[PDB]
Design a binder for this molecule. Structure first.
Ligand SMILES: Nc1nc(=O)c2nc(CNc3ccc(C(=O)N[C@@H](CCC(=O)O)C(=O)O)cc3)cnc2[nH]1
Lengths: 557, 555, 140
């Protein structure tokens, strides 16, 4: 029945965003249109409503990702729409997609099926320019570092200690490890460096954590690029780059007003990695949205062991938010993959594997309660699921003390989200949250890692390479030790081993390397090897993409 | 009284107003805030047969440290024509972001002849360049990924001519090695970056007729060769769809205005050596339907921008320039007279009278295309009346109308005298446009008719590399293409020391490159800087924006 | 190659002579026809491993050290000459020599037998010296 995803995005009737904005109580002079279906909202809206109370905050998360797929944003949008159908005054805030994937494997809707934010095609490409803003702010600093050396290197940097890489928003592996500054004395200083994908830029994380443009510049001034020969850090502040970087982001700092297929207003703004960063959209968008609405849905990247953790222990920490509930999105099939059933055999009913894989969901639910937040499970309905499966899954959610609702937002838009929405409102009305970050900043890095690892991952303990132990000593010594902690780990297990599905017991995390983001204001311990610059596949989608004389776009979505 | 100041104090009409003022519907306008917008190509298609208005190329005499002010004069001529009740718009190039952080960050034009909002124009504007940058870099990545995947096309990574771009002055990226890290990480090869406005993809945007022609062009782009020597194209990599896609918006020209609310287009902006330094054909050809008068410009002196304006931009689009302006200063002609930069406040009636042979050549050159030339003598406070008056006479004795232009100071009123001379030249002096050469010649005959007629050189020489590159290019059937001379702009010759009108000299062609996508051949005489660098005290260090959005240090 | 390796170690230890590594003219040598060594980049791997710089190899008979042997009067003259070999420049533009790196005694040491000419004969037993052998374009 259901048209494809791009098909649905064409036939959406979209309201002029200017209207949606006056509807929320935003003035015309706080609105910079980008065409008629996108706008950029002033930070002055927040400033004039600073003293208003916040709407309710509803975090959407998910169980441990899998081949089987789970659909988190589809649930978020269609949760938002269901809320709107019940007369509630609500917005959803979401991350902007990286352009790159559009040409490799993806792209796909912001959400899916009948639960989307739109215009789809602008959001997947240049949208309102936020990522080029980031790309050029990042690269200017790189180019300032490099020019610095070229002009006699006054700060007495060691070019081999330089951690500030370049960025480009394409999946281009050949740029991972390069050598720059070749050609002779007139041409730079030979040094080893490389590129990361732009959404993985620390500059992207600063935008997503900054309170305004002046806070964003301040943060920029504390970005560490490298070291001197004596071992002292050198910052962007020291190069006096922050005013220029700030300049390049003067529009980028404004969140982007768009809507859902059903015309529910929505902000898309920022969009960082959720392993080396926190995988949330801008504080700016979410804080603005809490004034305009009585209800705000937002999501975080990867599973609840990562995004949800970092949403609480970093995003709210900084903004001083207090989530009111959190929705855990789950699928009967992924639970079975967690129960040990292979991809191909996931349609076959198997109540045993479902129950045994349910431990993945049970552990997350328990994790959400460790922050003092009531949890509601959404079940992403799928045609193969039997009733005996769906029912077992409710008992189980119930046995574990969580409300649960079957969700059909993909097929039925906001109507499929109403059972769930009623369980949220029902939860909001009678189990107010008691929000608490998992850990205190004045612990030691090793303390804060174990906390996360043992309480959230169910890890026995943590191991550390010499390189790790040394970084930590050095960082703690530079006074960056009372900072929050951002675990970069595989999203496919609670553990650092992507093969360990379900709820692995009797295991241990191993920290190979520790990096720093003094701009964003956090420590990044790394367990696997992180891909901060993925590559295209052998048959990339760029080969099948076209657009004809009437702008008909085949091969993209 | 500074230029940024004057840019703040502009009473800017909403763009939407002008668009419908020009007969554009509400649905052909995609606003970017109230004072910028993009016009749809449907405006051209639906007025396809309505008549072009008049085409007035502005150009200039040979560049100098005196700084002649070519754009300012274009903006101030457009303002003038508007004050005379004439339906007119100007078409100009979008400036690179990068320079704003090195030394530059200037007005589109100057003084009281600007196009606004100045600060968005120098920054992200409407993202035309990021569209270019990503369309270029996608392709690079596609080439590199190809190799990673078994290199089916059997490319020689060392032949690869397709570089990357970024729109910052970053000299550290000029020569790099990529693809390191081992079999998982690409294929080691030497390459580099070039500023984004120097892209072939920028050139293509500025010559493409529509989005599909832009795509077709991309298809023909050459990225390198196979081990056998067979060229390999973006078409072979099936990349043109994806590049066209990333440019669906950038292909539309951007409506903005002047300080006196005269509608303006800013669309495209390429290099004027390895390319042809014009704004997009799209913008000017849309602009021809929306007015009776279109002013536009081309990069560097008339020997380059103007030659390539005529022999490339017009050839492709089938335009017929009705008049041409040649800007000049008294002080610039005095540099061409031998007087150094420090001493040019001093009157010097001989140096102006030996230096005038530069302008006298350009004017003779404009006459070779069958175009009526008119001079503009950009007025300056230190210019004597005897100097100015010697100039008129010399322009007159050369058989060209001339007018004083005080647009930097007097806005559109300063440019009335010129604007009248132009309209007088248009009402009675009809151009008979003719490209300087025919495409059916061999490459070397085209460089020669260029070198001789325009640059006034006695002949042309060729290194072995040049002869072989031509031999091969001609051998691949790219012989029947126009020619885009990559030469220093500071002389008629290939020697930047030779000011004035050098006689009895030669051009030497060291190297020859191709742009099968833009559809021309690029002979190189000097070495061309495709990636400048930041200076010792860059302007990014004092650039700042405060709690109120007030911006210091930029301009 | 010892000198090359002394130049490179110099930079690694804080670069007191304040050389510009991009001005270095002293290349390496190997006595094989190996084109892939013409243009290399050395000193990669990070702070513990040298200073990234562009250099290359020439064939050993084309070494300036070969020419000094072929022009020196004895071993002490050969060392003296070694001390005047120019390797590169400082940032200010002043030349830096092997003498300045105090390499000449070691280079001299490595050549203490090499300085002696080699007695051999012709098929018909006529005595003959073979000794040295430089390029005749960039040398004599
Ligand atoms: N990607 C994707 N995601 C989806 O969620 C999806 N959903 C459908 C349609 N999904 C479904 C899911 C469940 C039932 C179903 O068995 N519903 C039960 C109700 C269960 C209960 O309330 O306990 C029924 O029989 O009514 C039907 C269709 C089709 N394609 C999809 N594709």
């Amino acid at each position: 029945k259901v048209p494809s995803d791009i098909e649905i995005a064409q036939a959406a009737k979209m309201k002029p965003v200017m209207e949606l904005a006056r509807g929320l109580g935003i003035q015309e002079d706080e609105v910079e249109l980008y065409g008629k279906y996108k706008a950029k909202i002033s930070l002055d809206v927040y400033r004039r409503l600073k003293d208003k109370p916040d709407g309710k905050l509803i975090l959407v998360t998910a169980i441990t990702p899998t081949p089987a797929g789970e659909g988190k944003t589809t649930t978020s949008v269609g949760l938002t729409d269901a809320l709107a159908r019940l007369g509630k005054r609500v917005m959803v805030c979401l991350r902007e997609p990286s352009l790159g994937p559009s040409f490799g494997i993806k792209g796909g809707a912001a959400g899916g099926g009948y639960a989307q934010v739109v215009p789809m095609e602008d959001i997947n490409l240049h949208f309102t320019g936020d990522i080029h803003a980031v790309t050029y702010a990042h690269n200017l600093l790189a180019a300032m570092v490099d020019n610095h050396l070229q002009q006699g290197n006054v700060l007495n940097i060691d070019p081999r200690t330089i951690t500030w890489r370049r960025v480009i928003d394409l999946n281009d592996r050949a740029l991972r490890n390069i050598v720059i500054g070749l050609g002779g004395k007139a041409n730079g200083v030979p040094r080893e460096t490389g590129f990361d994908i732009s959404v993985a830029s620390e500059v992207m994380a600063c935008l997503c954590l900054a309170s305004d443009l002046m806070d964003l510049k301040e943060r920029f001034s504390r970005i560490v690029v490298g070291y001197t020969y004596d071992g002292k850090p050198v910052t962007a502040g020291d190069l006096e780059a922050q005013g220029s970087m700030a300049l390049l982001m003067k529009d980028a700092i404004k969140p982007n007003l768009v809507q859902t297929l059903e015309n529910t207003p929505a902000f898309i703004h920022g969009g960082p990695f959720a392993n080396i960063a926190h995988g949330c959209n801008s504080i700016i968008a979410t804080k603005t949205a809490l004034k305009l609405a009585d209800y705000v849905v937002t999501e975080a990247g990867f599973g609840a062991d990562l995004g949800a953790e970092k949403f609480y222990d970093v995003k709210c920490r900084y903004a001083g938010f207090k989530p009111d509930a959190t929705v855990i999105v789950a699928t009967v099939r992924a639970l079975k993959m967690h129960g040990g059933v292979p991809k191909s055999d996931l349609a076959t009913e198997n109540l045993e594997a479902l129950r045994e894989g349910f431990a993945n969901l049970e552990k997350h639910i328990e994790n959400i309660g460790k922050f003092g937040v009531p949890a509601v499970v959404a079940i992403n309905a799928f045609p193969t699921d039997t009733e005996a499966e769906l029912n077992l899954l409710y008992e189980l959610c119930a046995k574990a003390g969580a409300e649960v609702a079957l969700s059909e937002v993909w097929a039925k838009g906001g109507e499929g989200g109403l059972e769930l929405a009623r369980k949220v409102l029902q939860t909001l009305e009678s189990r107010p949250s008691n929000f608490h970050v998992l850990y205190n900043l004045d612990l030691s890095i090793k303390d804060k890692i174990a906390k996360i690892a043992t309480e959230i991952y169910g890890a026995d303990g943590v191991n550390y390479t010499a390189e790790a132990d040394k970084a930590i000593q050095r960082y703690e010594s530079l006074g960056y030790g009372n900072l929050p902690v951002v675990m970069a780990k595989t999203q496919y297990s609670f553990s650092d081993d992507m093969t360990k599905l379900g709820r692995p017991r009797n295991f241990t995390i191993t920290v190979r390397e520790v990096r720093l983001s003094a701009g964003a204001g956090f420590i990044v311990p790394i367990t696997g090897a992180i891909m901060t610059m993925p590559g295209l596949p052998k048959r990339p989608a760029a080969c099948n993409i076209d657009i004809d004389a009437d702008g008909v776009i085949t091969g993209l979505f």
